[PDB]
Amino acid sequence: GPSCVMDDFRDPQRWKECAKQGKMPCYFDLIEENVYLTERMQCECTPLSKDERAQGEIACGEDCLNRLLMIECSSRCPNGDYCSNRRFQRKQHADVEVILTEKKGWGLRAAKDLPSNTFVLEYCGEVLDHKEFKARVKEYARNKNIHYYFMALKNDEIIDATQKGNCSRFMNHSCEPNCETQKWTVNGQLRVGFFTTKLVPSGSELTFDYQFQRYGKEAQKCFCGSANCRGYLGG
């Protein structure tokens, strides 16, 4: 099918044009941070020498205490500019494209090879309390929407990327996936991002195991094509 790049989403009227020809997904409002309907210490890594920075060595890598608790550092981190643990904030996203699938709608694929436990994208959207969430479920059912964009963030917080979000919203489900969600604390506030669970060759679709609690017996069928396909979306 047709494909497109994350920069294509920055030109609104051209996008809408590409959408008229079916060369891009339908329009949504692009945002770079979660938006709320309901109004809401440093680590101990030793500073790296300028020599160690030049050698290729990692600042706040795997032993960093902020990182081990999936907390990103701030500006006041000991390693300052060198800190590798500010990925959400610096928007250090993987190189991925938005493509048209056979039966799932649009999707995400890797433009380059991507290592294991590599950051893909933040799942951004409108954060909802339980009440707003239920309002929208019903509103969406009554508009006969086909695609749904809900992601559980925490107790009484669900991200809805139906109207406002970013390209994370195109990652499809798979019963045998190559990414997972991770919840990270940034400035005392929780966020969700997608991360590879294995190596993902260039061209391959990126998928995760969506486990949002299924309500009815009734569900969306799964066209993931795996050997182990559970048949439907949801947990």
Ligand X SMILES: Cc1cccc2cc(C(=O)N[C@H]3CC[C@H](NC(=O)CCN)CC3)[nH]c12
Q: Applying CB under 6 A, which residues contact ligand X?
A: 137, 141, 148-151, 172-173, 210, 212, 215-216, 218, 233
Among 2, 47, 61, 105, binds ligand SAM (CB under 6 A): 105
* CB 159, min distance to ligand X, A: 9
* CB 235, min distance to ligand X, A: 10
**Comparison of 216 and 231: residue with beta carbon closer to ligand X:** 216
Binding flag, residue 3, ligand SAM (CB under 6 A): no
Reduce the DSSP state of residue 141 to 3 states and report it: helix
Q: Which amino acid is at 170?
A: F
Residue 106 assigned as binding residue: yes
* CB 199, min distance to ligand X, A: 22
Q: How many CA atoms lie within 13 A of 135 on its CB side?
A: 8
Six-digit token string for 112: 């380059």
Distance CA 29, CA 126 (A): 11
**Comparison of 119 and 149: residue with beta carbon closer to ligand SAM:** 149
Distance CA 155, CA 133 (A): 12
Distance CA 186, CA 74 (A): 8
Six-digit token string for 163: 């109207």
Residue 26 assigned as binding residue: no
39, interface contact from Zn ion, ligand SAM, ligand X, none, CB < 5-8 Å by kind? none
* CB 72, min distance to ligand SAM, A: 24
The closest alpha carbon to 213, from 191, 192, 184, 233, belongs to 233
Q: Which DSSP letter does residue 221 get?
A: B
Q: Which residues contact 135 (CB under 8 A, 6 or more apart)?
A: none
Six-digit token string for 16: 């809408």
Binding flag, residue 168, ligand SAM (CB under 6 A): no
Residue 73 assigned as binding residue: yes
Residue 130 assigned as binding residue: no
73, interface contact from ligand SAM, Zn ion, ligand X, none, CB < 5-8 Å by kind? Zn ion
Distance CA 99, CA 22 (A): 11
**Comparison of 48 and 60: residue with beta carbon closer to Zn ion:** 60
In DSSP terms, 119 is beta-bridged to: 195
Q: Interface residues with Zn ion (CB under 5 A)? A: 43, 45, 60, 64, 73, 77, 83, 85, 175, 222, 224, 229
Give the residues lining the site for ligand SAM (CB under 6 A). Answer: 104-107, 146-149, 169-170, 172-174, 220, 222-224, 233
